[PDB]
Write a structure and sequence with these properties.
By secondary structure, this protein is an alpha+beta fold. The protein has 4 domains: 1-94, DNA polymerase, domain 1, CATH 1.10.150; 95-151, DNA polymerase, domain 1, CATH 1.10.150.20; 152-257, Beta Polymerase, domain 2 (2-Layer Sandwich); 258-326, DNA polymerase, thumb domain (Beta Polymerase, domain 3, 2-Layer Sandwich), CATH 3.30.210. It is built from 15 helices and 10 strands. Helix 1 packs across helix 4 (86-92), helix 5 (95-104) crosses helix 6 (111-119) and helix 10 crosses helix 12 (209-219). Bound molecules: 2'-deoxyuridine 5'-alpha,beta-imido-triphosphate, manganese (II) ion (2 copies) and sodium ion. The site of one manganese (II) ion (MN) has 4 residues, from loops. The structure holds 3 DNA strands. Residues 186-195 are annotated as: Involved in ssDNA binding. Its EC number is 2.7.7.7.
Length: 327
Amino acid sequence: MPAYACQRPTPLTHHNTGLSEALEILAEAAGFEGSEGRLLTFCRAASVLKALPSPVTTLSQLQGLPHFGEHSSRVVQELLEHGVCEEVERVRRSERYQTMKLFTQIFGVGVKTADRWYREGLRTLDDLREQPQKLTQQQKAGLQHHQDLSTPVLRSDVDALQQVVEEAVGQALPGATVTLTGGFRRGKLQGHDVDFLITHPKEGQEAGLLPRVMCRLQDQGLILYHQHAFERSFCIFRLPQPGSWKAVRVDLVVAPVSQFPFALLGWTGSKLFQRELRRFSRKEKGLWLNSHGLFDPEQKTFFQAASEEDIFRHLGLEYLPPEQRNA
DNA sequence: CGGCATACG
DNA sequence: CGTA
DNA sequence: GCCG
Ligand SMILES: O=c1ccn([C@H]2C[C@H](O)[C@@H](COP(=O)(O)NP(=O)(O)OP(=O)(O)O)O2)c(=O)[nH]1
Ligand SMILES: [Mn+2]
Ligand SMILES: [Mn+2]
Ligand code: NA
């Protein structure tokens, strides 16, 4: 088992679901308390279990697995022996965890805002609604639309949504393309949102594209919320439903075709996979990776990539298709 | 012990 | 600060 | 919380 998640395939479904879910609760709790290091270790341990070829049945099977020390091993031990980890259950039922989860789930609220609200004594969505002058416009949208945004987006919704985005994109710039990224590209059947990456085959033609796309979607009556030169938009869209509609979160990102492989790689995720890939790049290869490119800080040069395959090769990693990036 | 990804709105 |  |  290699130590970085980008060095091993991680499928969407696996053989240690219960164990990984428990470790991810502890990760989430760590994040709520501002401990990014502990969040990372718990996420990485969870991901290791996702990458295993069969279920862990005995504690000895954790011996020599990366990211399993005393704490993570004890969590697994208790789950294997009793079907439940007391620490995890204590977290699940803490007022602190439940409220931080509720608040951070709101579009426009992060850990820092949630924590302040918690310290101020606020606990429920109706608590926030009763003092709305204190909310940003983004948070007001997030709170108004919270119920719809809490409903999973279905893979069967994505097709009709991509069609409307393509129509707007084609008027904004003929020849521009729309590629489905995010979790759906990794094979997820549901999502919290839909992520689309937009480019044009002629380098430079994509400049100024996103405002044009957004103004057109807005004129079609499809945009319940967006922030508005820019290249990423975090929207709430009106999606048709039987006799009605629902609000869904849609992310649009534009990249030049030169950068498209890097943007596709970054936006396809998973989040942990990309963190691990960027960590690997810098720490093991001395190269700086982001969603725009891959920089050699010695040569002061950028790697031209024509594909995701190119990027994996340049980093000395075996290629993983999107379905095996579910770290 | 230091480090923990790296951007844009 | 929020967001991916 | 863990690797390195
Ligand atoms: O902090 C982040 C968040 C997202 N990303 C990348 C990876 C992620 O898979 C992708 C899309 O982000 P989403 O928040 O939409 N998550 P995803 O599509 O993987 O799952 P879902 O939308 O179902 O929660 O953007 C990062 O690199 N860093
Ligand atoms: Mn997504
Ligand atoms: Mn998204
Ligand atoms: Na949030």
